[PDB]
């Protein structure tokens, strides 16, 4: 229970099925960790990073110990697709962070002006 959450939104895309999602993981423990996986209900998510402006999906990304994972613009990013309509400002959409040697960590992402 030594990670946690902040700078959590996902700006509006200009998409009915896909979005980028940001937020930051805290580790303040003295042993790394890695995000496995996410779920939400509102579509499938993914991890993607950002290389020369492509994305690619990655499996495992670290949190490392006593450091944090930052998931931003032109950066990593949760990718969010399968969408059913476009999200709008004023929605949030919730996922869960599941760690491969931590407990769940249930997130909040209100949608933003993009
Ligand atoms: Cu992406």
């Given at each position: 229970?030594?990670?946690?959450?902040?700078?959590?939104?996902?700006?509006?895309?200009?998409?009915?099925?896909?979005?980028?999602?940001?937020?930051?993981?805290?580790?303040?423990?003295?042993?790394?960790?890695?995000?496995?996986?996410?779920?939400?209900?509102?579509?499938?998510?993914?991890?993607?990073?950002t290389?020369?402006?492509?994305?690619?999906?990655?499996?495992?990304?670290?949190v490392?110990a006593?450091?944090?994972?930052?998931?931003?613009?032109?950066?990593n990013?949760?990718?969010?697709?399968?969408?059913?309509?476009?999200?709008?400002?004023?929605?949030?959409?919730?996922?869960?962070?599941?760690?491969?040697?931590?407990?769940?960590?249930?997130?909040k992402?209100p949608?933003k002006?993009?």
């Amino acid at each position: 229970a030594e990670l946690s959450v902040d700078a959590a939104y996902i700006p509006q895309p200009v998409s009915d099925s896909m979005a980028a999602g940001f937020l930051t993981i805290t580790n303040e423990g003295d042993s790394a960790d890695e995000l496995t996986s996410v779920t939400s209900e509102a579509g499938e998510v993914t991890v993607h990073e950002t290389i020369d402006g492509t994305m690619k999906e990655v499996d495992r990304i670290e949190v490392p110990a006593h450091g944090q994972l930052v998931f931003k613009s032109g950066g990593n990013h949760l990718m969010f697709e399968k969408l059913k309509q476009q999200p709008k400002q004023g929605q949030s959409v919730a996922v869960e962070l599941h760690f491969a040697h931590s407990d769940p960590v249930a997130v909040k992402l209100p949608v933003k002006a993009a």
